[PDB]
Amino acid sequence: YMSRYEEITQQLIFSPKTWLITGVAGFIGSNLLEKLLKLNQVVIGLDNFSTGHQYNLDEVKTLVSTEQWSRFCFIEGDIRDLTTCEQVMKGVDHVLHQAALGSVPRSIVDPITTNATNITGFLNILHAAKNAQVQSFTYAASSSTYGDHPALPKVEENIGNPLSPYAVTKYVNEIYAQVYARTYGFKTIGLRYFNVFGRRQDPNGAYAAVIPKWTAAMLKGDDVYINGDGETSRDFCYIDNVIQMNILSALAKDSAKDNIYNVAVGDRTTLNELSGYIYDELNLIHHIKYREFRSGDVRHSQADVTKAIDLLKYRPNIKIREGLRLSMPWYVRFLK
Amino acid sequence: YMSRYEEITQQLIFSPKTWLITGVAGFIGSNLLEKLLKLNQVVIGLDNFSTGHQYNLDEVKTLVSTEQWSRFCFIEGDIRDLTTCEQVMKGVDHVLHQAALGSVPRSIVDPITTNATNITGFLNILHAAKNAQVQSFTYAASSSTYGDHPALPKVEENIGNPLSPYAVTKYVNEIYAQVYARTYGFKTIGLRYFNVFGRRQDPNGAYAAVIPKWTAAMLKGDDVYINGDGETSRDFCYIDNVIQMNILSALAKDSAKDNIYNVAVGDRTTLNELSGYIYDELNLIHHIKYREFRSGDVRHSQADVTKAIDLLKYRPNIKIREGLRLSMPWYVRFLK
Ligand SMILES: NC(=O)c1ccc[n+]([C@@H]2O[C@H](COP(=O)([O-])OP(=O)(O)OC[C@H]3O[C@@H](n4cnc5c(N)ncnc54)[C@H](O)[C@@H]3O)[C@@H](O)[C@H]2O)c1
Ligand SMILES: NC(=O)c1ccc[n+]([C@@H]2O[C@H](COP(=O)([O-])OP(=O)(O)OC[C@H]3O[C@@H](n4cnc5c(N)ncnc54)[C@H](O)[C@@H]3O)[C@@H](O)[C@H]2O)c1
Structure with missing residues (x-):
């Protein structure tokens, strides 16, 4: 049983909200799509088929009601273009940002493109959401931000030096997220997958x-x-833990926001x-x-997932x- | 007397090198231009007249020999465009990166533009220089990276949390510079002005x-x-201290590189x-x-400038x- 989680999903099935999933055709984004449509949510999706697939969207369509599917507005676009980011925020309640180019080797050979998508692309979404005045903002961060810290298991407050362009971009997501809390009072939750x-x-x-x-x-x-x-x-x-951790976070109490949490x-x-x-x-x-x-x-x-367990009532069941x-x-x- | 500095400038007047100054029409960049041309160096310059001025270049032309000026190749362009960054690296020996949008209030209101120039722009130059295989790379960092650390005076190893988008971009410059050392073995020197x-x-x-x-x-x-x-x-x-600190660094010994130094x-x-x-x-x-x-x-x-004094033989004379x-x-x- 995932109790708080069960409780949260019930609430949603009744007072449905509008969600934005970036990287929605990717692996984690398509999983989130599946779950949210099954809870009769309205979803607006954004992907640019960089690493995502049209077939991932297709498969999802076969797994859900056709009244459930009618609520999905998919958009082919780029988080790298700020204008797109804004059109897509219109009327959104919860943001689930998953759009990014992953992989350490990839950043090592082409850092420029990785930078553009992971930092420029992230800031765009984050800013757009701030201005649209959404209710929550949850973004994909990386266990890689621990870098060369030697502690096991890893605990959120203790990171070391980043060992690759990829790690940097992800660290930079968090830092931006924090500054946004300081300077605009806009509270996020970053998940270190x-x-x-x-x-x-x-x-x-x-x-x-x-x-x-x-x-x-x-x-x-x-x-x-x-x-x-x-x-x-x-x-x-x-994934089912990650899917769980996204929802817990989007509806988390305000005192739990502006926080980083391990997801594992x-x-x-x-x-x-x-x-x-x-x-x-x-x-x-x-x-x-x-x-x-x-x-x-x-x-x-x-x-070390006790922070998640504590503040969000997380349950790694699988x-x-x-x-x-x-x-x-x-x-x-x-x-x- | 600035002794190591004197020593370095003599060397240069004899074995002149090709320098690249970004933000060369700006305040600090134009000051560097004046100095380098007086030492008969070959200078390639890049600015986009964002905050820089054509009149700053003009004034410099009235302060220097016309044989000295003939060695300046000025370029109107943007560090935001990677292609520019590469054309301008051709044959460069020392890089002095000063191109950025400064100011804390400015980042607070338009973080997107500040981000693009300070991070995307910085990464471009840094990458371009790595590939061109330059001899040195020195970039403008900010005392702002200390953020909320309460120590006085400020010491390079101890920084706290960044308190604005501006501070973040500059912090991110350093982090990138470090990762570039780890992953490509490309050693830089960042100056916290x-x-x-x-x-x-x-x-x-x-x-x-x-x-x-x-x-x-x-x-x-x-x-x-x-x-x-x-x-x-x-x-x-x-400025004459900052001008001094840039030169000490470009010609610094390899064991002094991959380091951050206060400049004050x-x-x-x-x-x-x-x-x-x-x-x-x-x-x-x-x-x-x-x-x-x-x-x-x-x-x-x-x-606290003792690090500079120690490793680079700096002398804050003014x-x-x-x-x-x-x-x-x-x-x-x-x-x-
Ligand atoms: N998978 C992990 O272990 C892991 C770890 C840390 C962080 N993350 C983050 O999880 C998120 C999803 O990971 P994934 O494994 O599911 O990746 P994925 O590649 O399967 O999903 C990425 C999606 O990104 C979209 N995309 C990429 N760039 C875009 C852009 N510029 N504009 C619009 N859309 C863009 C594509 O539609 C693609 O489907 C990414 O942020 C990944 O970095 C994943
Ligand atoms: N002036 C200071 O006291 C101070 C303090 C801290 C840091 N700095 C740093 O030193 C560097 C220069 O400082 P400054 O006071 O001379 O600022 P400045 O405004 O005088 O110089 C900035 C220069 O960079 C150019 N520029 C801006 N964006 C560009 C872009 N995208 N592409 C190409 N050129 C671009 C501008 O035209 C300008 O000439 C900056 O990086 C700044 O962040 C300066």
Whole structure:
């Protein structure tokens, strides 16, 4: 049971609001779309099909009522263009900002474009929302902002030095968010995601994330590469926690805003152990090389989510095993 | 005597290099131009006449040899456009990045534009320079990055929270500079200026800085406004120190790079005392209301320059009194 969360969703189903999801055709944004439409919300969506997909929107349309779908106004556009940002704010209540170019290697090779989308694009949305005078503003931040801090698990007040352009942009989101509270009194909630996985995470690409990259390879029968000695660990977080954490935040009490919160489960799984779980779970539906680490790669990563639990009444109900199990079917359909 | 500085300038007069000054029509940039051309350097200049002036370039042309001037290639352009940034890097040895929109109030009202120039513009130049593989890279940072830290004087390792969009952009310059060291091995030197004053500082404008704002008013005979109880203090720094600090840095030894340095004198003058010195010095060439503080205004400000003195052999030779005295004549000519 996710109790506060249940309570919040009930409220919404009755007094429906207008939401704006940027990066709505992406993995996390499309997940949020699914959930919000099922709660009969009015949604305005923004994506520029950089890393997002029209097919992700399509799939969502097959998962929801057609009266539910009628409430979605999709917009093909760029958060990089301030004018778009403003047209799309009209009448919005809650903002869920997910639009950004992710990935550490990507920023390392083209920082200019990453900067433009993640900082210029972020500030645009943030400003537009301030002026539109929305009721809440929740944005995607990154566990990467911890950088070289050696503490495990990671606690929000203690970050170190950023180790890549990507980490910087995300840190810069937070800093801007704070200054906006100081100078306009406009209160946000930033979520430091930690390695989210689940349905509709792109397994194709040079920047494919690990769980969907391995899963696709274990099916095609291709090699499975482990970038390093295979001891690196992470706090893998199923989408349903992230979806939960977004809603808790959009409707959070004012004293909880202007805050940064880790979004994860509190556990730690190794690149070796993961390969275990991904296989065990895939052969229950009937179907390993080593290399160097990456430049900018992180050694150990585990979150402390007590802040979330405390102030927002968060409930990480789905740990990694179950999460993989709820996921693999989606990748079979998608990979046939 | 400025001994290491003297030593450096001799070297240059012999093995002249190609320099790039952004914000070269501005106050600090035009001052750097004057100095570099007098040392027979080759200078490529970039400004977009946002806050800079063609007349500032003109004045410089009357202060220097015409063989000296022939070595200046001026370019009307924007650091916001990456392509410009690259054409201008061709063959450059030392970069002196001064192009930015200054002022705390200005960022508070239009953060989007401030963001674009100070971060996007900064990143462009920094990237361009990395690829061009220059020999040095020195950029204008801000004492504002101390934010809400209560220590006096201020010491580079200890900063607090930024209190305005402006402060954020400048802080973000530093962070980027560092990450560039980590990830490409490209070593910079950031200078945290502290309230620079001297010849060619625009006394006109809503955002005019204090010393030229008061000086122009004391001549026109207008009122002189003191934003607050007139106890606020600052470390006023004459340009010749900042000019000195830029050169020390461009030619600094590699172990001194990837560092941030305060640029100031170490002293502290009050808004009440300043009004004293500006008058005493102006009536020796023959010619007060109170209001509220500013939002984002700072209470006390004094730098610790020992790091500069240690690692770069800096010498703050000109304190405030003398500096005002060297300045007032320029404002008479300019204000007739
Ligand atoms: N996935 C993670 O582990 C993780 C970690 C930290 C932060 N985040 C943030 O989560 C958010 C979503 O991540 P994701 O994995 O779902 O990524 P994703 O690429 O799947 O989703 C990104 C979406 O961004 C949109 N987009 C990108 N740039 C845009 C622009 N300029 N204008 C309009 N739309 C644009 C596209 O429609 C795309 O669908 C991103 O902010 C990501 O940085 C994710
Ligand atoms: N003047 C000071 O006391 C002080 C204090 C702190 C920091 N600084 C920093 O020092 C640098 C110069 O200071 P200043 O007082 O001479 O300011 P300034 O206004 O005199 O100089 C700014 C110059 O940059 C140019 N510029 C602005 N945006 C540009 C763009 N997008 N592309 C190209 N050129 C652009 C302007 O035309 C102007 O010539 C700035 O980065 C400023 O932030 C100055």
